[PDB]
Structure formats: C-alpha cells, structure tokens
Amino acid sequence: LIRICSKPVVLPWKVPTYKDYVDLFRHLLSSDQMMDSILADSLNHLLYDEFVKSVLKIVEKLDLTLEIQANLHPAKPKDFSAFINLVEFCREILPEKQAEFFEPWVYSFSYELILQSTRLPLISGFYKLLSITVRNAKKIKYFEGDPEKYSCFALFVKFGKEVAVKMKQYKDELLASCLTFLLSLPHNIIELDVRAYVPALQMAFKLGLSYTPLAEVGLNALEEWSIYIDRHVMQPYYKDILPCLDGYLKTSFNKVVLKHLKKTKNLSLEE
Amino acid sequence: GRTDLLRLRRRFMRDQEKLSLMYARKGVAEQKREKEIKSELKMKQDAQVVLYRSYRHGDLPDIQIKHSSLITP
Amino acid sequence: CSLLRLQETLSAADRCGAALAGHQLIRGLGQECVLSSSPAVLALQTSLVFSRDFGLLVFVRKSLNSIEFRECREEILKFLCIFLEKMGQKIAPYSVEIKNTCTSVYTKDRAAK
Amino acid sequence: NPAENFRVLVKQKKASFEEASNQLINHIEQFLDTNETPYFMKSIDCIRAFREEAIKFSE
Amino acid sequence: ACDVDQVTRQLYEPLVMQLIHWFTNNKKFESQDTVALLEAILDGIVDPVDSTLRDFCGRCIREFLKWSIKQITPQQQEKSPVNTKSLFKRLYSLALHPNAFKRLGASLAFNNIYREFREEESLVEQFVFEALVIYMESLALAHADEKSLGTIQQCCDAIDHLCRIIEKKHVSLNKAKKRRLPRGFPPSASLCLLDLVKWLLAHCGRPQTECRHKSIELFYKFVPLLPGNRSPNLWLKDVLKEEGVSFLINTFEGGGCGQPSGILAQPTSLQATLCWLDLLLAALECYNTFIGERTVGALQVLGTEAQSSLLKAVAFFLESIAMHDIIAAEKCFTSPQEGERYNYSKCTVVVRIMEFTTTLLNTSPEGWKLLKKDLCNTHLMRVLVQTLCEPASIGFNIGDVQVMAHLPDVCVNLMKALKMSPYKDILETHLREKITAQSIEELCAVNLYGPDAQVDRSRLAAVVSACKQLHRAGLLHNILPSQSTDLHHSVGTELLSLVYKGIASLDLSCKQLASGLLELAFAFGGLCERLVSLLLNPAVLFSHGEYFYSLFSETINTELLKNLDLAVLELMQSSVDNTKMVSAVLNGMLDQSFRERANQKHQGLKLATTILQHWKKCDSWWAKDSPLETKMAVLALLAKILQIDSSVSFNTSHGSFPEVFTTYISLLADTKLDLHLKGQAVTLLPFFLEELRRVLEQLIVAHFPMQSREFPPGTPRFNNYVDCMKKFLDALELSQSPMLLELMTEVLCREQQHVMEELFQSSFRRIARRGSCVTQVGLLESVYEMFRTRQSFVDRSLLTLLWHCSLDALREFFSTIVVDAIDVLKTFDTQITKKMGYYKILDVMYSRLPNELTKTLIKLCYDAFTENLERRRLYHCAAYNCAISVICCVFNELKFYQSTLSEEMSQFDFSTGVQRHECMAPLTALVKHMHRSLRDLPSWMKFLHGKLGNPIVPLNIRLFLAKLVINTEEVFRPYAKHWLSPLLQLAASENGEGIHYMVVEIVATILSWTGLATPTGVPKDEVLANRLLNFLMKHVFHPKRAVFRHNLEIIKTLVECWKDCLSIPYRLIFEKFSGKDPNSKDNSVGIQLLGIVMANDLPPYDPQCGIQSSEYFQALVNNM
C-alpha cells in the first residue's frame, strides 16, 4: 500500500498507473475458488483482516496538517495525495467481500475514524471512507433498533447531527461528501430527527442535478427511507421533497463478413 | 525533399527484425487498445462549449455590440 | 420497425418459387445481420421476438430443399451463431424452442441436404 | 579458479588434456602487465599440482 | 454569478464587478441602485445555502462601497440615502433580528469589508462602539441558540478585526470623544475607551460562558490600551479598592441571579435549571480565569466577598451529580425528556469544577488549601474518582468525543495537584476504597478470548486507563505497594499466563488489552529482568518466548528503550546459547531506535555504544564457530548498527572500534563464506589501514582469474560474480575511495567490455560530480600514477572522469602535472601507449578554457601528426584529436595552420535491509565549431575538394570524407553548387560496412536539396548522373519488398526533381518488364519501374535508338 500511495495523482517511457491494482485485489480478496484447488494438492477473511489492520495503521500514522496560506494549504501535499489515493482505493475495493469479516471493527474502527474526522472535519477522504464503511455496515445490517450496539448508535446519531448542522458551511468536493453521508445513513439511526435531514436531502438532490451519481444515491436512500419508515412523519415536508426533484424532467470491421466477431468477444444521465 | 535521408535511416532495417517488427506492431496495438479504452470514457464526457459573441473587459459596460452578436445566440 | 418490416417482407418474399426470391431473401437477411449486430441496449430485445417469429417462420414456411431456401437458412444460422456468441442468457426461453426447432431443422430435409 | 578445474578434470575424465594445458597456459601467461604476486604464488602452486598430475599416469 | 461552472461564472464576475462600478456614479446614483443594493443585502446574507453566495455577496458589496467612495465625493454619500452610515445601520439591525441567517450574513459581510473598512478614520471615529456592542449581542445570541451555528465563526472573526483595529488605533479612543452612542452605555457623554471597557466589565457574568470568556480576554488585553494605567493586577486592585464587595454580583451576575435563583431552581424548569447551570459555569470560569491570570487572589473571593453560590453548587453536586441523572428533585421537569444535553451540561459542570480545583490547588499554594477546607468534606473525592474509573458514573457521559478524550489530561493534573496537597492521602484511601488493585485480577481470568463476556474487557480497559492516569500523576504504590520486592509479579504473572495459554485463540481487542497490561507492568519497576527470563522460554508450541515477543514486539521495544544496557548485557550473556530470539530482539531495538528521530536518535547511539562494549561477550559467533546463518545474522545486525550510528566515531580508532573492525577483517578472512555473502558484507565498506586493502586483494584474487566470459551467462557462479561486481560498483560509488577505484579499474581493465563496463563508466560519471575537488584531484593523481593491455587502463578509466570532472579540480589536478606531461611528451610500444594517453587527456584538458608556457605545447603536438604498426595511425589520430581540441579556442579565426509515507517506506527498507566508424567524431564537432565562428574559403574545404574530387585517392579516405560531409552537409550548403561535382563521380562506380549503405546515404544527402544546384551545367555531370541511374536500376531489388519499395520512391523523387538531364535506356527497362516471361512473377518489378516513368510527365516511350518501338509494349500485354 505504501508503493500504491507513492504514485502521483492524475489531473485533467510509459508511466504505470495506480488505478489498475484494484483488479488484482478484486481477485485477491475473491480467491476462494483458487485456494481450494491449490489445497486439493476463511483465508480470504484473514487477508481481509490484515488489510483492515494495515489501513488502520495508515490512518492513525498519516498526518494531514495544513495551513491557510478559505485557503487550503497542506503542509504535506504529498501526504495529502497519498491519503486521497489510499481513500479512493479503499472505498473502491472494500464493498466487494463480506463485511461479516469487518464485523469486529464496526465499533473500534468507526470510533477511531470519527476521532480522525473530528481532528480535521474538512478532509473529504474521511467522508467517503466512512460512507463506504456505513454502507457495508447496513449491507450486513449491524443495526437492530447490545451495549456495543447502543454505543454505536449513539455515536452515529451524534455524528450525523453534527455533520448535518455544520454541513451548511461547506463547499463542493466536500459538501458533496457530506450529503453523501446524509443519504448513506441507514433508516434506523435517523428515525430520530428526520427534520434536520430534509433540507440536506433537498440540497443533495439539487446538487446531484449538477453531478448525477450524487442524485442517484440520494434517490436510492430516498426510496429506502420511504420503504422502511412510516409516512406519518415524512408527510409534512413532502411538499418540500417534490420541488427539488423537478430536475432531470425539464430537459430534452463491422461488415457482413464473418470474423467470428472477436470485437464482440471483447467487453450517465438518461439512466 | 529534405527528409529523404531521414526516411532512409528510419526505414533502414536491412538487419532482420521481422519478428521484432511483428512484436512491436502487436504491442503498440495493445497500447492503442488502452488508449481507446480511455478515449470512449473521454468522449462520454460532455463536449466543450462554444461561444457566439465576442467578449471584452472594462469597468463600465459598452453598448457597441453589433446586431449579429445578439441574434446569433 | 425496420427489423419488423424486413421480417414481414421476407415472410412474403418467399411466396413465389424462384431463385430470385431466395436472392432477395438472403440480401434482406444480410442487411438484418449487419443492422442488428450492433444494437445499443434495446433493439436486441425486439430482435428476440423478431427472431422467434422469423425463426419458426422459415422453420414451417421454407421447409423445402430448394437451394434458394438453403443459402438463406445457412445465413440465418450464421447470424444466429454470431448473435448468441455475445448475446447473454436472455435468449434461454427461445433456446429450447430453438432446440426443438434446430434438430427438427437438421433431421428434416436439411438431413437430405 | 581454473586450477581446480583442470585438477578435477584430469582425474575425472582421465585424458592427456591438452585443453587443460591451454587452460593453465592462459592462467600463467596473463601476468605481463600485472604485478599481482599472490596470484603468481597460486599460479606456480597449480603449476606444481599439474606437474605432479602429469608425472602421475602417462604424460 | 455564483454557480458550479468554469465559463459561466468566469464571464459573470467581470460583469458583476463592472455593473458594481457603474451603478454608483452621480448619474446612476439613486432609485435604481436601491434595488441592486437591497438585493445584494438579501442575496447571501439571508439564505439557507450557498456559502459561495455568502462570500461573493460579501466581497462584492465591499467593492461596491469602495468604488462608491472612490468615484463619488463624501458630500454626495452624506446627502444621498446611499451612505455608509445607512449600510452600517442596516447591518446592525440585521444582526439584531432574531434569525441565524441575518446575523451570520452581517458578520461575514463585515469580515469581508473589514480590509478596506479599517482604512477609514472618520467612520471608525464615529462608529466602533455600536459595531462592538452589536457583535457582542449577536455572538451572545449565537451562544443562546446553538454553538454549532456558523455565525459564531463570523462573529469571532469580526471581533478579532475589532480588537485588531482598537490596538492598531487607540489614541482617539483613549481620549473621551463625543462619538455616536451605541445601544450599550445608555448614558450619553463624550465616549472614551475606558467607558465601553468598564461597560463590558460590568456586564461580565453572562449565561453565554464563552462569549463572556472572550469578552474578558479582550478586556484584559485592552487594559494596557488605556491612556492612563498600564495592565497589572495593581490597577485591578485599584478598581477593587472601592468595589471590594460589589464584584460579587457586578462581575458575577450569575450563581442564580446572585444567590437566590439558584436556590429557587432546586424545588422548582429543567431548561431554567440548565440556564442556571450554564450561568453558574460562566461565573466559575470567570473565577478560574481571574485566578489563573494571577490578577486576583483566591482569598479576595474567599473573605472579602463570599459567593454562597459556590457552596450552593457544592450542595447541588451532593444533590444532582452522579445520583440525580434523571431529575433535580424539583419534580417539575433520554430525548423525550432531553437527557442528552442534560448530561452534556452535567459533564460541562464536572469539567468546569475540574479546572476550578486544579487552579485552586496550583495557582493558589497550600497556604490557600484552608480555603479548600471551605467545602469541609470535598465530597468530590468520593465521586470524581468514579469519574476516573467510569465516565458513565458522572451521569452518562455518552458520546465519547474530544471532551471526554481531553478529560484524562486535566484529571492527571488534578491528581498531581491533590498529590502535593494533603488530601491525596484520603483520596488514596478513596482510591483503595474504589479498588483493591487485585480484586480485578481474578475477574480477568474468565478466558476473554473470542466468544466471551465483553463487560469484563470494558472494566479491564477502565482500570487500565485509571492506572495510566495514576502513572501520569506519578503515583503507582498509592493503590498497590510492593508485594515482596519492587518486582510486582501480580501483573507479570498474569501477562505470562495469559500470553501462553491463549493458544496452549486471539483477538485484536484482547491484544490491545494485553498491551495495556504490558505497559501497566512496565510502570512497575524491576520487571525487566523477569521479562528477559520469560522471553528465554524454550517451551515449543516454535518456542513460546519468541512467540510472545512476536505478538508485542513494539511494546517490548518501547519498554527496553528505557533500559540502557542491563537487559542488553543479560541478552549478551545469554546470547552464547540463544541466537534467534536474541537477534530478533536486537533488530527490534535497532528498528525502534532508528524510527525514533523526531526527538533524537541519541538513545540509539547510546544503545550502539553499549552493545559495542558487550560485543566481546558473545564470541561463539562471527568466526568459524557459528553456523553461516548466524554469521549472516550478525553481519546484518552490524550493518544496521553502522547505518544507524554516525561514521565519525568507530570509523577510525575509537575504543572498541578495532575489536569489531579486526573481527570484520576476520569476517572477511573467512574463506568458507559464499563470495556473494562476502560481497554483501563488503557493501558496508563505504563506512571506511593497509590490512584492509591487502585482505581485499587476497580475497578478490580467488574470484576473477583472467576472464568474465569463461563463466557462461546464466551460470549460478556467473550470476554470483555479476552480483558481487555490482555490489563493489555501488559501494565504491558511495565511498569514492581511491584504492578501491584502482582495484576495480585493474580487475576490469583486462578485456574490452567483458565485466559489463557500462555501469563502470556510468558510475564514474556520477562520482565525477561527487566528492570534494581536492578529493577528485587526489583520485586523478592516484590513477595517473598507477598508469605509470597497459593502455586499456587509462583508455577505459581516465576520460570518464575527465569529461565529467568538476572544472575546478580539473585545473588543480592538471596544473599539478603540467610539466609532468610536457617532459614525458618527448619495446617502443610503451612510449606510444603513454603518448596515446597523454593526447587523450590533454585534449579533454584543453576542452575547458584557456601561465604562458602553453604556447609551446601546440607545436609539440602538431608535428606528432605530421609524420609520414597500426599503433602509428592511432597515434596520428590521437595527436590530431588533441590538435583539434587546442584549436577549439586558439585559432578561433580562419588560417588554422594546416514524506511520512516515504519515511515509512525507508524504515521498512532499513528493517528489511534492502534498498559505422567512430575515429572521426571530433572532426564533425570541429567543423560545427568553426562554422559557429564564421564559394571559397581557406577553411581547407577547397583543399578537401581537391583531395576528394580526384578519382585517384585511397577508397578509405573517400569513405571518411564522405561520412564527414554527410554529417556536415549543412555548413557548406551555399557551397554545394560545387560539392555536387565530386560526390557524383565519387558515387559513380563507387566500390567497409557495405557499398549500398554509403551509396544510399550519399544520394539522400545530395538530393536533400534540389533548387540549390542541378547536374546540367557540364556534360560530365549529367552523363555521370545517367550512369549512376543505370547502376542503381541494375542494383534495385530487395526481398524485403519494403526497403525495395523505399528505393522505388527514392527513384520517383530523384527523377522528378530534375527532369532536365535524365535519360531512359528503354532497353534494360525492356528486359526488366519482359524478363523470361514465366508463369511466376519476376519481371513485374520492371513494370513498377514504368510507374516511376509515369510518375513523371515524360513521354511514355521514346525510341532513343529503337528497341523495336512496335512490339516494345507487346511484352507488357504478355506479362498482363
């Protein structure tokens, strides 16, 4: 992972890319069908655990101090680039295998992670990685209404309240991740104080109009909450919910020769 | 025709590299596959915007804009 | 649509007994091949039912050892092969039907030719 | 290094080994522009070894 | 104008600034600017979203006011409704209005405008106090509604600007000036600085605790701003003299609106109770600030004016803290009851009384601990210790955030402050009341491993944290004294038993719990040696002690850093029979010490010194007495040591330096070692007398007898050799030690390019720029002396350095040997080889720049070439190259006399210990240089024209001159009007790398230009051109069918470039397109020839004499 984060970041002799390696890990964590064959003549969960420990040690190790010379001036911009690289890799790799493997870390990992976020509540990488964390947590559905579970719920609800109250002070590439949180939360936790999330949800859709994936995931969260929570509390701000959805609605070789089509052998906003 | 020597030396392969030429062809082919893989994603991005009126910059706006510049938009 | 109108014309185009009928049929089949070989996400699904009707269409209509039918049938088969090569399992409802056709296709006059 | 090579060669394939003779000639001869005296020591030592080996059987 | 896009906003901001500039003139002055200004007021200042809109509206209205003042006279603003004062009044009113948006927008707008607003004097003279009081009340309201509100940041920035300008400019404020009266200070008079200063002081004691804290901090920093008294506590005493008791309610309006409302809240309102609590905390923090600033004594509030609200709060803690977490006994009133912020307020009260106790104990010495007796019980010692052991015992303390994470440090501070106080003993009793320090050790034996209880781990962590806090307080035996000795085996026995019986499973939670237990044991002294014994556990699962080390290697390294050499010495004595685990723990020591460099590595240096003395106590290794693995391990250990310590001590004779250095030599003397491993050990030689080099030779002799190709490529011995030689190369590149340079040159300079000399010369290229100039001079002198095949040494070595040596060391080294070369400049093979080297070094010498003897040297080389066995030709070439060099400067005219991740990676690497002819080349350069300095010329090209145009001249000379003119065609382009004449006849009947190579090269060079000249001026030129056409069309074929085609287009180009002097034989062409007329394809090439003929516009066929002119084309249809 140190070699992974060492490679610089692309901005809009051959230079190898960082982004490729995920495919490796894509098989690396999904190699049951190979180790069983090699065992002919569990362990992927062990690799999962080792990777989680490594990302923990990196998160605690890395320093993200910055200056105002508002003005985002990192003191270690190379460390910032390594951080964002590791964040993108971790949240593009994580939602593949079982978060059942992640179950031991659901409390301590989230706790130290919230601490790190509170250290500098302006680094969007924290936001993306915690969003994928909670996404996996609701994928395995750790939420039921145990002292560890209740402590988890308390941390989640207070963190959601504070992000929802301090999100109005944030800008693009950061507030986008904040609304990514505010949609990525499970229905169970936000069953208290749904009101605070309503303007956040409205802004999330009106900004996902400008960037489709945010609108898509906000939509998904919206039907999730509609399914799980009783309408009687969501009713009053339905007249608020609909107008922010007005967007997306008001706009408007290869011949008869037989090559066995090796081309076919190889393999938005309207959606 | 000043590149005649240049084209002579660039196409100077009287030593045998026909297998190497085939390998270079194939390898460059896969790199072109990678380039076009990037290309379909690049073209998926919205095409660049164009403007139909000139633009100057002062501190008190002028009304010296032609009829063309207003009817083209 | 173009696929549908071409299917209807070919279902007609074999009404007369002449090699010219087979020529026009195979030409229309070649155009259909080069057309529906590159759908986006949708025209393939229309082509599924079109292939159903036209498949069973020739299965029960052509049914003759005349070569004018033979070249059209072989081009149809080649197109179906290159289609199913990259088409997905969505064709599975037709497949067993096609199976019930294909052997019946082969064991019939196709066996004689 | 070729010293032990021809030492084991003569007793492993049992030939007059003019190739071994040429090997030792190359071993000794490349001393004209160098003053590496310990190399000369081991060179004359392998010379004695090959002399004894040649005395041994037939040559 | 504020949208998420490049082009739109990018064109919008010039528009908005342009219209802002326009809509303030006397013409665009009133009744249309009103809409623009009011909307710029209501755009971002009031909105729920778009921080971008907020900042944009802020600085655009800033620039609007700036430009309005710039281009409109002050009388015009004053008479018009559009005036700065109206804007200020609007801002004040908006901040006054009870909505978050208005206040935050007004504050941020002021923040933006402040940069230009501070530069105006009349406005601030008339308007500061109003802005001051407005911002005070707005920030108080921001406290009232929610602290998380973004308004608080804008307000604190605004008041930062206010204090910045008040300290920047105070003379006008210092004197009483009749400025506009704000809402504050209801009496109207000549406003002064001290007026509003004391007005703020009297208002201290507000429910907004941090608003009051900022107000009093600003007060304190403005005390020196007063025109009279400076800012000691003495002036505060002067204020206190008359107001000895009034401060009880004046400066502290709280405690229950004075005393009573605090008593009122007890029987009867929960929100009112929280208001009482926060106002009381404001008073308490004001007390804490006063007593921590040392601006007032504790007895001043403890015998002059006595706030009974303090004892009321103490009784309330006896009534509400840790026992009333749901109701304050008022019986008049979780989220439905909102116990969340109730517990938050309770925790805030707890922390506030924590700073109060700490400041009382610290800022007031034990002489004021009698005032600590005012509680008469200090019941807190019974409950706050629970705070230390269970946060859930202060109420709930749920949330687990930076407030409770910050609690432990102030808790330790209070523990120390009470430790210097007597009451600690009672607290110590309370401590022993709260825990026995051993009632938990049996309860942690419940097999907490995977599936098990979790509350057990919970209070294990709780007691671990409490004991860590106590250790930070400098107290460990107040709860657990010595059992039998200083060694507290109560923890170490549990450690060993648990770590052994965990598998005789695992968990990260129990792992960190065991780590906490390890550090708790480390708090107990003397356990180090017992732990050392435990690590030496031969109990096999692999051994168990090494397993325990593997589980917690980092913790053991941290513990053993404190121990200097005691355990180090014990391991050294126990190293005689233990090798693996001792090496592992030594490596852990080294890695942790090397990692520790933020403060210092001097701990690592001392550890290296101690192991240096201990070195001679493990003699079973590093000789023919230990396994090769042991020798490799000790080599790795000492390499780690060497890279850790500085190479100035124990690099020369320094105490224990020889005892290992000689050992090192003995280690090098061990011939049983692998030569690869020997090179690995050598790799550390950059850290460094005759014995060293002599053993170096005696080793390297047994490696490379005479050749590198005697060992086939891929042979394992061969790969060993290449690895060793690259080790030597890199080590020498790091060291630049001259003797190793000479050794490498002499082992390499045996055959040309057999030891992979590319890296050799390239490493020389780097090391030429490295090292001191004097070091480079000495190195060059050493290699020059060892010079005195034999020439192969200098040929492969010197020019590498010389071409890249520093141009200062060059001067020194050469000036050292000027006459040393002049004299030697004047069987015989030795002489010619030495002169070879001398020319090849003097040319590079001269290449740099220009005493007075040098004039002679020119002739001394010139004759060296002019003499008229191959070594003689090489000598002439070298002499002429040196002459070219010396011509490069003299005879410049004509007449030439014919990161954190990076740190982590480095630490990991450290722990892993793993990091066609050429003799004429200067001729072209000289031609280029002389062209740069400056048809016909006495530049010898007339001489060369005569030398080359004659048919009678040796072919090699013609090839040389042709290659030169090919590489130098550009210079004599405005002389090619003659150069076509020789080359043509040189190309004609031209006969060595291969004829066609130079043929195609020269024809391409000639035909690079066509308009410059054409071969038609003399019959000979065109007849020779036609002859060359015949030769090429006889020679034109290739099986490659590509270079063949390439020649086809070459012909196509050359025929169409002239079309004036060319002839078509039509006979050879006839037989080429006719051929034998077979079934196969052989004559089709001739067909393609006709394409060139019809690439031309020339007539299709001409009977030059007539082949047949009738069936001449019958062959065409026959071939068709």
Coordinates of N, CA, C and O in Angstrom, one line a residue, chain E residues 1014-1077:
Chain E
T1014 N 21.7 21.8 -59.8 CA 21.2 20.7 -60.6 C 22.4 20.3 -61.5 O 23.2 21.1 -62.0
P1015 N 22.5 19.0 -61.8 CA 23.6 18.5 -62.7 C 23.3 18.6 -64.1 O 23.0 17.7 -64.9
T1016 N 23.4 19.9 -64.6 CA 23.3 20.1 -66.0 C 24.2 21.2 -66.6 O 24.2 21.4 -67.8
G1017 N 25.1 21.7 -65.8 CA 26.0 22.8 -66.2 C 27.1 22.3 -67.1 O 27.6 23.0 -68.0
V1018 N 27.5 21.0 -67.0 CA 28.6 20.5 -67.7 C 28.2 19.1 -68.2 O 27.5 18.4 -67.5
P1019 N 28.5 18.7 -69.4 CA 28.1 17.3 -69.9 C 28.5 16.2 -69.0 O 27.7 15.2 -68.8
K1020 N 29.6 16.3 -68.3 CA 30.1 15.2 -67.4 C 29.1 15.0 -66.3 O 28.9 13.8 -65.9
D1021 N 28.5 16.1 -65.7 CA 27.6 15.9 -64.6 C 26.4 15.0 -65.0 O 26.1 14.1 -64.3
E1022 N 25.8 15.4 -66.1 CA 24.6 14.6 -66.4 C 24.9 13.2 -67.0 O 24.2 12.3 -66.8
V1023 N 26.1 13.0 -67.7 CA 26.4 11.7 -68.1 C 26.7 10.8 -66.9 O 26.3 9.6 -66.9
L1024 N 27.4 11.3 -65.9 CA 27.6 10.5 -64.7 C 26.3 10.3 -63.9 O 26.2 9.3 -63.3
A1025 N 25.4 11.3 -63.9 CA 24.1 11.1 -63.3 C 23.4 9.9 -64.0 O 22.8 9.1 -63.3
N1026 N 23.4 9.9 -65.3 CA 22.7 8.8 -66.0 C 23.4 7.5 -65.7 O 22.7 6.5 -65.6
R1027 N 24.7 7.5 -65.6 CA 25.5 6.3 -65.3 C 25.1 5.8 -63.9 O 24.9 4.6 -63.7
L1028 N 25.0 6.7 -63.0 CA 24.5 6.3 -61.6 C 23.1 5.8 -61.6 O 22.8 4.9 -60.9
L1029 N 22.3 6.4 -62.4 CA 20.9 5.9 -62.6 C 21.0 4.4 -63.1 O 20.2 3.6 -62.6
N1030 N 21.8 4.2 -64.1 CA 21.9 2.8 -64.6 C 22.4 1.8 -63.5 O 21.9 0.7 -63.3
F1031 N 23.4 2.3 -62.7 CA 23.9 1.4 -61.6 C 22.8 1.1 -60.6 O 22.7 -0.1 -60.2
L1032 N 22.1 2.1 -60.2 CA 21.0 1.9 -59.2 C 19.9 1.0 -59.8 O 19.4 0.1 -59.1
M1033 N 19.5 1.3 -61.0 CA 18.4 0.5 -61.6 C 18.9 -1.0 -61.9 O 18.0 -1.9 -62.0
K1034 N 20.2 -1.2 -62.0 CA 20.7 -2.6 -62.0 C 20.7 -3.1 -60.6 O 20.5 -4.4 -60.4
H1035 N 20.9 -2.3 -59.6 CA 21.1 -2.8 -58.2 C 19.8 -2.7 -57.4 O 19.7 -3.1 -56.3
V1036 N 18.7 -2.3 -58.0 CA 17.4 -2.0 -57.3 C 16.7 -3.3 -57.1 O 16.0 -3.8 -58.1
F1037 N 16.7 -3.9 -56.0 CA 15.9 -5.1 -55.6 C 16.1 -5.4 -54.1 O 17.2 -5.2 -53.6
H1038 N 15.1 -5.8 -53.4 CA 15.2 -6.3 -52.1 C 14.1 -7.4 -51.9 O 12.9 -7.2 -52.3
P1039 N 14.4 -8.5 -51.3 CA 13.4 -9.5 -50.8 C 12.5 -8.9 -49.7 O 11.4 -9.4 -49.5
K1040 N 12.9 -7.8 -49.1 CA 12.1 -7.2 -48.0 C 10.9 -6.6 -48.6 O 9.9 -6.4 -47.8
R1041 N 10.9 -6.2 -49.8 CA 9.8 -5.6 -50.5 C 9.3 -4.3 -49.9 O 8.3 -3.7 -50.3
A1042 N 10.0 -3.8 -48.9 CA 9.7 -2.5 -48.2 C 10.9 -1.5 -48.5 O 10.6 -0.4 -49.0
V1043 N 12.1 -1.9 -48.1 CA 13.3 -1.1 -48.5 C 13.4 -1.1 -50.0 O 13.9 -0.1 -50.6
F1044 N 13.0 -2.2 -50.7 CA 12.9 -2.2 -52.1 C 11.9 -1.1 -52.6 O 12.2 -0.3 -53.4
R1045 N 10.7 -1.1 -52.0 CA 9.7 -0.1 -52.3 C 10.3 1.3 -52.0 O 10.1 2.3 -52.7
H1046 N 11.0 1.4 -50.8 CA 11.6 2.7 -50.4 C 12.6 3.2 -51.5 O 12.5 4.4 -51.8
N1047 N 13.4 2.3 -52.1 CA 14.2 2.7 -53.2 C 13.4 3.1 -54.4 O 13.8 4.0 -55.1
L1048 N 12.2 2.5 -54.6 CA 11.3 2.9 -55.7 C 10.9 4.3 -55.5 O 11.0 5.1 -56.5
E1049 N 10.5 4.7 -54.3 CA 10.1 6.1 -54.1 C 11.3 7.0 -54.2 O 11.2 8.2 -54.6
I1050 N 12.5 6.5 -53.8 CA 13.7 7.3 -53.9 C 13.9 7.7 -55.4 O 14.2 8.8 -55.8
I1051 N 13.8 6.7 -56.3 CA 13.9 6.9 -57.7 C 12.8 7.9 -58.2 O 13.1 8.8 -59.0
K1052 N 11.6 7.6 -57.7 CA 10.5 8.5 -58.1 C 10.8 10.0 -57.8 O 10.5 10.9 -58.5
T1053 N 11.4 10.2 -56.6 CA 11.8 11.6 -56.2 C 12.9 12.1 -57.1 O 12.8 13.3 -57.5
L1054 N 13.9 11.3 -57.3 CA 15.1 11.9 -58.0 C 14.8 12.1 -59.4 O 15.4 13.0 -60.0
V1055 N 14.0 11.3 -60.1 CA 13.7 11.6 -61.5 C 12.9 12.8 -61.6 O 13.1 13.6 -62.6
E1056 N 11.9 13.1 -60.7 CA 11.1 14.3 -60.9 C 11.7 15.5 -60.4 O 11.2 16.6 -60.7
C1057 N 12.8 15.4 -59.6 CA 13.5 16.6 -59.1 C 14.2 17.4 -60.2 O 14.4 18.6 -60.1
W1058 N 14.7 16.7 -61.3 CA 15.5 17.3 -62.3 C 14.7 17.4 -63.6 O 14.5 18.5 -64.2
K1059 N 14.3 16.2 -64.2 CA 13.6 16.2 -65.4 C 14.2 17.0 -66.6 O 13.5 17.5 -67.5
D1060 N 15.5 17.2 -66.5 CA 16.2 18.1 -67.4 C 17.4 17.4 -68.1 O 17.7 17.7 -69.3
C1061 N 18.0 16.5 -67.4 CA 19.3 15.9 -67.8 C 19.2 14.4 -67.7 O 20.3 13.8 -67.7
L1062 N 18.1 13.8 -67.6 CA 17.9 12.4 -67.4 C 17.6 11.7 -68.7 O 17.0 12.2 -69.6
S1063 N 18.0 10.4 -68.7 CA 17.8 9.6 -69.9 C 17.3 8.2 -69.5 O 17.6 7.7 -68.5
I1064 N 16.4 7.7 -70.4 CA 15.7 6.4 -70.2 C 16.3 5.4 -71.2 O 16.1 5.6 -72.4
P1065 N 17.1 4.4 -70.7 CA 17.7 3.5 -71.7 C 16.6 2.7 -72.5 O 16.8 2.5 -73.7
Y1066 N 15.5 2.4 -71.9 CA 14.4 1.7 -72.5 C 14.8 0.3 -72.9 O 13.9 -0.5 -73.4
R1067 N 16.0 -0.1 -72.8 CA 16.5 -1.4 -73.2 C 16.6 -2.4 -71.9 O 15.9 -3.4 -71.9
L1068 N 17.3 -2.0 -70.9 CA 17.3 -2.7 -69.7 C 15.9 -2.7 -69.1 O 15.4 -3.6 -68.5
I1069 N 15.2 -1.5 -69.2 CA 13.8 -1.4 -68.8 C 13.0 -2.5 -69.6 O 12.1 -3.1 -69.0
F1070 N 13.3 -2.6 -70.9 CA 12.5 -3.5 -71.7 C 12.7 -4.9 -71.2 O 11.7 -5.7 -71.0
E1071 N 13.9 -5.4 -70.9 CA 14.1 -6.7 -70.5 C 13.6 -6.9 -69.0 O 13.3 -8.0 -68.6
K1072 N 13.6 -5.8 -68.2 CA 13.1 -6.0 -66.9 C 11.6 -6.1 -66.8 O 11.1 -6.9 -66.0
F1073 N 10.9 -5.4 -67.7 CA 9.4 -5.7 -67.7 C 9.0 -6.9 -68.6 O 7.9 -7.3 -68.5
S1074 N 10.0 -7.4 -69.4 CA 9.7 -8.6 -70.2 C 10.2 -9.8 -69.4 O 9.5 -10.7 -69.1
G1075 N 11.5 -9.8 -69.1 CA 12.1 -11.0 -68.4 C 12.0 -12.2 -69.2 O 11.9 -12.2 -70.5
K1076 N 12.0 -13.4 -68.5 CA 11.9 -14.7 -69.2 C 10.5 -15.0 -69.5 O 10.3 -16.1 -70.1
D1077 N 9.5 -14.2 -69.2 CA 8.1 -14.4 -69.4 C 7.7 -15.8 -68.7 O 7.2 -16.7 -69.5

